[PDB]
Amino acid sequence: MLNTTFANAKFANPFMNASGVHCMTIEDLEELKASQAGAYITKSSTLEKREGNPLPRYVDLELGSIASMGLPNLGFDYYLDYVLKNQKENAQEGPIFFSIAGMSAAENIAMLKKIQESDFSGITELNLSCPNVPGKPQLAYDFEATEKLLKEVFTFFTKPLGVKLPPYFDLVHFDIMAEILNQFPLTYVNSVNSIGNGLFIDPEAESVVIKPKDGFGGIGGAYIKPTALANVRAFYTRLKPEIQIIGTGGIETGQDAFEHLLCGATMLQIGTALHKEGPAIFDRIIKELEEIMNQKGYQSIADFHGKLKSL
Template identity: 60%
Template sequence: MPTLQATFYGHTYDNPFMNASGVHCMTTTELDALADSAAGSFVTKSATAEAREGNPEPRYVNVDLGSINSMGLPNLGLDYYLDDAIKRQASHPDQPFVMSVASYQGFNEYVANMRKIQESDYTGLVELNLSCPNVPGKPQMAYDFEDTDKLLTEIFAFYTKPFGVKLPPYFDIMHFDKIAAVLNQFDLKFVNCINSIGNGLYIDEATDTVVIKPKGGFGGIGGEYVKPTALANVRALKQRLNPSIEIIGTGGILTGRDAYEHLLCGASMLQVGTQLEKEGLGVFERLTAELLAILEAKGYASIAEFKGMLGTLD
């Protein structure tokens, strides 16, 4: 029988599946449910310094091939998630997870949030979210390569615990080259790609209106729509980043085959967002069964035998 065990930053997980930050992770109750699910691990809601209600409703809508959202970073604040992370780490040291951190105010808030974590008792992995596309009037940090360089330089001047970054999708080969050149300067443990494709628009055919309220209907696109873009980003960054920087593949994972393709492109762990929102926590049991069936059919004993082994037509 093949194994779906995944090794990520020195830990071995039963399988590579996680939630994507923003889905089923707002409260400690939801995080407890994730920890008890068939997922290999989980990530918390991206936390800002202060609690935020986020954008007005409706701000998330499931559509035919995925979802559109403009959530606006709703969360219960960094102290809430950090306090829970410290307790959870102490009580369940054998269940490592990822704490996600964002910023609403920009550069200085990113630095202050990371400084607070550095000074805390939490020693686990942190995901620094540089890619929230759904805050009105706020740009995505990771699309500014110079500012991303400055931010990581400032954080690494004092931060000694393990962390990685969550990235937006890139669409140009030159941009893959540029972001990799920035990230390769630092001792990052992972990159997570991709966040949703920003500023899409979906129209209700019955009403001829947009379907979400914030930003005039513009929102991040997730689900089946984004899988080719997600796979390209996983593949491109795997080819360009230092081998020590692992990849979390996120975007368009609906089936075990989708998960297999992310792994084939070089991902070590996988995050599920839209399909988790649509299907609930049972999605992880289904995905593990489907992925296991693919390994059996192909004669693989483990993920390590094919991870990153995507073929080309050269």
């Protein structure tokens, strides 16, 4: 029932981890391969291996999560080696997704050139929205800089590319970004990265709960679903149809998934809830989404994809 076509590839179901969650090592990635996720994505990588921010840097909250990981990762070459060996095995349905989050424009271009030159045949996600590296703003809140970067990328990069975007809150920003993105042969936009620079306080201790940046961290989970849905929907009605959408933010239940898809998402990623539950989440949420479709008499996601009704 959950068969999906995305980036010209076939997936068994739309569900994936979100980048940063359960995907740091090869062991993590093999556990996602082994789970019922339709597809999976590596941790955003940088050219060099990174320890990330000081701890405590992730905390579970009743309504979601707050974190400031600081892009801990094992470095671009580690991930590139892994995806290049797994592609050769032909041991799963659908390509692996490879996320990069260079610490500068130069780092991103260098990694994209290495991907282009490699044999990698999967999908790349360019992360323009990490909100947790000290002193490094979300690039995709700088429309001029984003356009300048993407224009350079598309002078050479011919393989499937999506962009991971921060949440936007003003409809003219959606208009501006769609106009920028629509001039390129982009494969997809992935909406939303964590809501940037939120704060959570333990009122008893009178103190923040993560160490980095005086407690300021990206917010994920049930807090952000309204914004995530709006960002998916707003881009679905403004992007050219050649650019598909991955929906991320506040997905825990089949109902949440069913609301992203109604908005126009084609693939779905799970961050916070997967952090909390582990890869068993995929079998649970798939069954919850199929139960909603069965109740409604739907036998494919095309029966309601994109079909959110206005009043």
